[PDB]
Amino acid sequence: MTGELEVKNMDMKPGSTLKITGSIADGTDGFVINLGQGTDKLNLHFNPRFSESTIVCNSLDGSNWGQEQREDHLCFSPGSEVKFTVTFESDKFKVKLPDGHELTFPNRLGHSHLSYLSVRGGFNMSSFKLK
Amino acid sequence: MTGELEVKNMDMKPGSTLKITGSIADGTDGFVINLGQGTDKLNLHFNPRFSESTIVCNSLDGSNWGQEQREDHLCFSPGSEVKFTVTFESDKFKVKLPDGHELTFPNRLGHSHLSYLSVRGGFNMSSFKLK
Ligand SMILES: OC[C@H]1O[C@@H](O[C@H]2[C@H](O)[C@@H](O)[C@H](O)O[C@@H]2CO)[C@H](O)[C@@H](O)[C@H]1O
Numbered sequence: 001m002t003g004e005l006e007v008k009n010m011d012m013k014p015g016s017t018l019k020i021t022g023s024i025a026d027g028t029d030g031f032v033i034n035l036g037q038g039t040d041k042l043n044l045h046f047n048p049r050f051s052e053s054t055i056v057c058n059s060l061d062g063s064n065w066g067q068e069q070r071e072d073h074l075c076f077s078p079g080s081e082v083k084f085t086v087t088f089e090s091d092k093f094k095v096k097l098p099d100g101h102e103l104t105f106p107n108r109l110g111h112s113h114l115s116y117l118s119v120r121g122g123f124n125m126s127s128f129k130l131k
Numbered sequence: 132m133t134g135e136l137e138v139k140n141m142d143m144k145p146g147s148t149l150k151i152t153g154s155i156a157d158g159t160d161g162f163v164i165n166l167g168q169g170t171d172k173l174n175l176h177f178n179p180r181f182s183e184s185t186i187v188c189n190s191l192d193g194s195n196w197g198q199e200q201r202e203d204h205l206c207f208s209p210g211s212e213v214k215f216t217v218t219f220e221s222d223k224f225k226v227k228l229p230d231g232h233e234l235t236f237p238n239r240l241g242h243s244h245l246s247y248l249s250v251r252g253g254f255n256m257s258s259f260k261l262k
Contacts (some may be wrong), residue, residue: 001140002246008137021260115133124142129152129258 005119010130012114014090021127023081028122035086035093036060036109038116043109044086044093050078057095057105066108075099078122088114135249136256143245143261149217152258157210159253166217166224167191167240169247174240175217175224178252179205188226188236197239204232209253219245 030049036042042060059066087094090111161180167173173191190197216227221242
């Protein structure tokens with residue numbers, strides 16, 4: 001749980017962008033970027049899985065997971081230092097990948113401000129900036 | 132509470148540096164950057180007070196505040212975008228102010244790594260970077 005950052009009481013409004021930098025650990029099979037209103041309401045569950053060569057995106061409403069969206073476009077490595085840019089729109093999430101490719105994921109949980117960011121698995125966030 | 136950012140489960144070790152950027156809200160009497168083990172274990176309580184033209188540094192162990200240390204080097208103004216760099220040593224904290232002046236504050240709460248950051252008052256943190 002150490003190094004598994006959670007950022008609370010953010011105020012992410014539609015149109016804002018979040019840039020995340022960190023290093024992926026040697027020997028990790030995947031990691032998670034969770035962004036939403038809290039531990040119980042995840043608008044965006046962003047889960048690259050190196051062992052499955054895919055990126056799963058999903059939403060979480062309470063204890064009920066939404067329908068998973070897999071994006072076979074996993075073009076970064078374990079053991080690297082990478083950047084993610086998440087854009088919060090009222091209808092969609094816009095995740096720029098370290099290679100310039102962009103994933104889009106529908107926002108299924110309304111237009112509320114985003115206050116909760118958490119990192120799971122083998123990703124050590126070294127910087128974040130919010131605009 | 133909205134906008135009062137919390138960063139939990141950091142891994143800030145002796146020798147590590149924390150660079151925080153943000154904007155001071157207009158007409159505020161002060162703001163707070165807290166660094167420590169948790170909400171009740173604050174190794175560094177960094178509190179610029181513009182109503183008092185001084186920067187208060189203190190520690191919090193449970194419900195017990197230490198002795199305040201005031202530094203009459205408050206040379207930034209509300210509405211401005213300031214940047215602080217906090218360097219964590221087992222012996223003391225070093226806070227580089229926006230004009231370069233370095234403040235020292237003793238670590239009274241043990242060498243144990245820093246995992247908790249919180250911001251209060253008229254400060255909206257826009258970025259941090261751990262190095
Ligand atoms: O929605 C993904 C989410 O749930 C877990 O993954 C599922 C898995 O995708 C599913 O095929 C299997 O039946 O159960 C797992 C757990 O319910 C993950 O643990 C988590 O990482 C999330 O990504």
